[PDB]
Design a protein around this ligand. Structure first.
Ligand code: NI
Length: 341
């Protein structure tokens, strides 16, 4: 049964709730972004409206094969009427096509649902700057002060450096980047840019990338592995036995891999900086973990919430245990007492 934190009061609307069957009263099923936890359930056999971004809609039509009529894409940053409820979609700074949704209820309540987001100061000069938000449905993935991690630009720096170093030192080395969903495309696009290359990938990943409205994408990516020296592989496969396997396939064309595992937080964020990173090493394969996050750090989240001064906060992540719920409420209370709202 659909949880209350996936329903919007005073509407027939639900958010990311595609895995329960029909939800009684639901005129509309919103989908914030194309990640399997949020979309779990959709297929070609949906015949209710889905409202989402254009990019999420391309993925619905081409990867899940939903029929064009039931995908209502909406532009971003545009006031839109949806069953005589005003809504706006705003960029979530998550993966491609990820949005937050502003709901303007008839009764005068305003609700923001963040979907998955990496909070940023550029959001403080968006359409949110214009009016009061009473209820916040909040991505609480890293709501604890241990969760720090670097900026995405800092990390793309490290990467462009490691890669360009090694390739210039050994011109027969391959760069590999791990992936398992959309997100984090900047890692591989940035490295390939510095190496004078396209990125090579499976047919299925090529298909996924061609749905994202990336400008100039035909010049950036290829399914011809042979012709490329930045390759993408499944994240499952980014290990020694699996990278050995792959290093064979390339047919004596490279004598060293240098891999990157963009990950979220790990416990080695607590004791090691990004400039002082190392990889595991079993022979000529060298696997880097680099903490490129598409969720808010604790500080980033804190700042956004203290700016917004919502009257009420509804967590959407880590809500499955009483201990996590309780810990989260305590931080929300501190933030409110500090900030005077
Ligand atoms: Ni996500």
């Amino acid at each position: 049964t659909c949880p209350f934190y996936k329903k919007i009061p005073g509407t027939g609307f639900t958010v990311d709730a595609f895995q329960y069957g029909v939800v009684e009263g639901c005129t509309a099923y919103f989908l914030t972004h194309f990640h399997s936890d949020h979309y779990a359930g959709l297929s070609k056999h949906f015949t209710f409206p889905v409202y989402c971004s254009e990019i999420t809609g391309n993925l619905l039509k081409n990867k899940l094969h939903v029929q064009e009529q039931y995908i209502h894409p909406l532009p971003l940053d545009t006031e839109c009427i949806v069953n005589g409820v005003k809504v706006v979609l705003l960029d979530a700074n998550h993966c491609p096509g990820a949005v937050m949704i502003l709901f303007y209820l008839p009764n005068g309540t305003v609700i923001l649902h963040t979907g998955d987001f990496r909070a940023d100061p550029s959001m403080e000069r968006s359409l949110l700057a214009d009016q009061k938000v009473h209820m916040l449905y909040l991505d609480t993935t890293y709501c604890s002060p241990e969760y720090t991690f670097p900026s995405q630009q800092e990390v793309i720096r490290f990467a462009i450096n490691t890669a360009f170093e090694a390739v210039t030192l050994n011109p027969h080395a391959l760069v590999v980047c791990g992936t398992y969903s959309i997100g984090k495309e900047k890692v591989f696009l940035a490295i390939a840019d510095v190496l004078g290359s396209k990125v090579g990938m499976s047919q299925e990943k090529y298909k996924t990338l061609q749905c994202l409205n990336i400008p100039e994408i035909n010049s950036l990516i290829t399914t011809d592995m042979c012709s490329s020296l930045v390759h993408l592989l499944p994240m499952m496969q980014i290990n020694f036995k699996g990278l050995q396997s792959h290093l064979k396939k390339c047919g004596g064309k490279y004598n060293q891999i240098l891999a990157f595992r963009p990950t979220g937080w790990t416990h080695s964020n607590k004791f090691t900086r990004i400039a002082d990173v190392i990889p595991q090493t079993k022979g000529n394969i060298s696997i880097y973990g680099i903490p490129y996050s598409e969720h808010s750090s604790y500080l980033e989240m804190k700042r956004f919430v203290q700016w917004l001064k919502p009257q009420k906060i509804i967590p959407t992540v880590n809500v499955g245990t009483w201990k996590s719920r309780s810990t989260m409420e305590k931080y929300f209370r501190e933030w409110k007492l500090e900030a005077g709202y």
